[PDB]
């Protein structure tokens, strides 16, 4: 009775610029409750399905966040897989790829990397992992340069469906004939996906969306960039897990996961939604001046989006609201 489970994430975004607010606290206890989570379900290995990283220049405290989680995470036997995303750097990534060697994680950050066995916690063969990142075009591309032509977004779709298609026959000889699941990663947006504001388009101009059926037939597809938490084509097994934390206004009030991932020799068993706990109060305030008058005199502060439709003027509105917010037990960020 083999078991192989893995917790799905993605989306991080550390270090964002929440309406000059930080993200750190959220993203501390969220990582705290990871860190309990992953030895609740005595989890065999994380992975981060694109993202971590709001930029590719992270601060400090962001970047601290994700090396003690990272430490932290030793005292579990987890391992770890942190896939770069589109707004991720390589080169950040990469800068600590073979230090997170020797601390049981696998940094992969560019395209090209070979799949591999993911250990059990006792290091016997849990998994096989195709380690598959956000594809830079121009990384996937180097199979045939696609130029002085017309149908390039033909061609990228092609070149990412020939890649997971190349992965994925390495993936089964790897496997040999070990009742082993394989696990695939990806970042990108599928055909169909519901997308939320923070979510920022990719591949401009050559892929409108990713059709989930070119994916291989790996046991579990696990896929990040979209940041709320949906199956893919119908599939139970095609999934964003959705970002761990609300990324933008529209986000808040719906739930934020993480999937925690059970195999059972060698094949899918089931996949649990485990809530992430919400620490930081956000909530949208719609309708007319009185209605929004109306609204916040009921209540951490809580972060406030104002969205208005009542034609009146530019700056007005928010001298009024600074007036009307003031000294209340709240914050407000936003105002449309």
């Known amino acids: ?26 993203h501390q206890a969220f990582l705290d409750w990871l860190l309990e989570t992953a030895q609740t379900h005595q989890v ?27 430490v932290n995470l030793q005292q579990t036997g987890c391992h770890l897989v942190v896939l770069a995303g589109n707004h991720d750097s390589v080169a950040t990534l990469n800068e600590s790829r073979d230090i997170m060697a020797f601390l049981n994680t696998t ?17 016997t063969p849990g998994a096989v992992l195709c380690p598959i990142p956000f594809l830079r075009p121009r990384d996937i591309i180097t199979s045939q340069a696609g130029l002085n032509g017309i149908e390039k977004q033909q061609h990228l779709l092609a070149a990412i469906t020939d890649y997971y298609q190349q992965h994925y026959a390495d993936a089964c000889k ?21 997308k939320s504001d923070a979510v920022r388009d990719i591949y401009i101009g050559t892929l409108d969306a990713f059709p989930a059926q070119n994916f291989p037939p790996a046991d579990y597809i ?9 199956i893919i084509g119908g599939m139970e097994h095609v999934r964003y897990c959705g970002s761990p934390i609300p990324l933008s206004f529209d ?40 209605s929004i008058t109306a609204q916040l005199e009921q209540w951490p502060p809580v972060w406030l989006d104002i969205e208005i439709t009542t034609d009146e003027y530019l700056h007005d509105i928010q001298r ?8 209340l037990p709240v914050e407000v960020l936003l105002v449309r």
């Open 320 to 327: 009024k609201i600074q007036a009307l917010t003031e000294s």
């Open 107 to 123: 940094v992969v950050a560019s395209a090209g990397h070979a799949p591999q066995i993911l250990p059990r916690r006792d290091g």
């Open 174 to 194: 790897l496997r040999g004939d070990q009742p082993l699941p394989i696990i695939a990663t990806g970042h990108l947006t599928t055909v169909g996906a519901s």
């Open 1 to 26: 009775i083999e078991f192989m489970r893995i917790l799905h994430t993605s989306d991080w975004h550390l270090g964002q610029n929440f309406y000059s607010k930080s993200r750190e606290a959220e």
């Open 222 to 230: 696990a896929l990040g960039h979209i940041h709320r938490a949906q």
């Open 44 to 70: 065999d290995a994380i992975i981060v399905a694109g993202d971590v990283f709001d930029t590719g220049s992270p601060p400090s405290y962001a970047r601290t966040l994700y090396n003690r989680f990272v």
């Open 251 to 290: 986000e808040c009030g719906k739930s934020k996961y993480v999937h925690l991932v059970t195999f059972s020799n060698g094949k899918l068993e089931s996949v649990e939604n485990l809530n992430v706990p919400v620490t930081q109060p956000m909530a949208v305030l719609k309708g007319d001046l009185a």
